[PDB]
Ligand binder design. Structure first.
Ligand SMILES: Nc1nc2c(ncn2[C@@H]2O[C@H](COP(=O)(O)OP(=O)(O)OP(O)(O)=S)[C@@H](O)[C@H]2O)c(=O)[nH]1
Ligand SMILES: [Mg+2]
Ligand code: NA
Length: 345
């Protein structure tokens, strides 16, 4: 009686890939933001999270669902951005641990690179369903764009030189995946999603292929991800970062992976001075489709259902530890037991 339309969960998708492959730029094109331009050195140094309500995903896939026949079943999707720079393997591992499905970004002009291989191992270890965004197609020489088009509609319009270049680069990337033990196919040439990795060509600059990628991730959620993860179960939450925010004191940014968090909840998490026990005074999200990791305006909530990226204002968070689990003390819980439990992992 819990696997039904009244208990749906928004799943979590991680975007992984080698440095400078376009992971942040793809998310900026989806959000209609400019986070990448605001990063020092254009380098992502923190895990990001953006929530997409299913209404926005429907709109942003309309050009590859013109007849309206694709059935959306998820309520929304939380997408996690991760660093590609070699020095952030800990945050790729943390992000991957949180996700239920993933996009692996490959620059079509460079193929598989060391952090591509690292990310592929993280996904395989957790049996995470994924597709590959073969990004930067606009760098094919003579590429002719239509902004935000479906990949097939745009590829049909390309000259013979571009089609040959695309095919050569696609074949090279397929060979590299096979050398790593993965069979792969262009996503409309793929007979089986499970058997072979789907490859979806994209441009974060023109937006082409992004509708196809969004449709594919929704299909991964509804068709490949364990069905139990489409529905809410016990609370799971993880601290990402500790940030002082004007008006809200020292706050924490948290991925709520499962269950429901409520304003007023008694929470326990790891701290530098020992376990922190406190009460949520404000339970915040960014606006839809805006990054948790960028300071902005916030929406206040009495409750937030998973999965979401939230900011919590509460007394006593100064020494909160990134990576900590976060537990909610229920009526029959022993608070000291919960303390021992967050510090045990
Ligand atoms: N031509 C072209 N350039 C792109 C595309 N996607 C990203 N870029 C460019 O590549 C550079 C890196 O993009 P960025 O979004 O920072 O990658 P990233 O994967 O997030 O990088 P990081 O967090 O691992 S350091 C930027 O200059 C961006 O404009 C694309 O589709 N086409
Ligand atoms: Mg980035
Ligand atoms: Na970058």
């Amino acid at each position: 009686g819990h696997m039904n339309k009244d208990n749906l969960r928004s799943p979590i998708c991680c975007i992984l890939g080698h440095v400078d492959t376009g992971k942040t730029k793809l998310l900026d094109k989806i959000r209609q933001t400019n986070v990448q331009e605001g990063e020092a050195g254009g380098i992502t140094q923190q895990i990001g999270a953006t929530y997409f309500p299913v209404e926005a995903i429907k709109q942003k896939t309309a050009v590859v669902n013109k007849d309206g026949k694709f059935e959306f079943k998820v309520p929304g999707l939380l997408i996690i951005d991760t660093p590609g720079h070699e020095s952030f393997s800990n945050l790729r591992s943390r992000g991957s641990s949180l996700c239920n499905i993933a996009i692996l970004v490959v620059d079509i002009m460079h193929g598989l690179e060391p952090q591509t291989i690292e990310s592929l191992r993280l996904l395989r270890e957790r049996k995470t369903p994924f597709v590959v965004a073969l990004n930067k197609i606009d760098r094919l020489y003579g590429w002719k764009k239509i902004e935000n088009n479906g990949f097939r509609e745009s590829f049909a319009l390309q000259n013979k030189a571009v089609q040959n270049e695309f095919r050569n680069r696609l074949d090279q990337v397929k060979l590299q995946f096979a050398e790593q033990g993965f069979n792969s196919e262009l996503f409309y040439e793929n007979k089986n999603f499970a058997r072979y990795v789907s490859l979806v060509p994209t441009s974060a600059h023109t937006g082409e292929g992004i509708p196809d990628m969004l449709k594919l991730i929704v299909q991964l959620c509804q068709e490949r991800m364990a069905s139990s993860l489409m529905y809410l179960s016990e609370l799971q939450a993880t601290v990402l970062e500790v940030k002082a925010i004007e008006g809200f004191g020292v706050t924490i940014d948290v991925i709520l992976s499962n269950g429901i968090l409520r304003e007023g909840d008694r929470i326990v998490l790891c701290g530098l001075e020992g376990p922190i026990k406190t009460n949520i005074r404000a339970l915040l999200t960014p606006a839809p489709m805006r990054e948790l990791r960028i300071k902005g305006q916030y929406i206040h909530h009495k409750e937030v259902k998973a999965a979401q990226g939230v900011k919590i204002s509460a007394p006593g968070l100064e020494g909160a530890i990134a990576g900590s689990r976060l537990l909610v003390v229920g009526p029959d819980d022993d608070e000291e037991e919960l303390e021992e439990e967050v510090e045990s992992d």
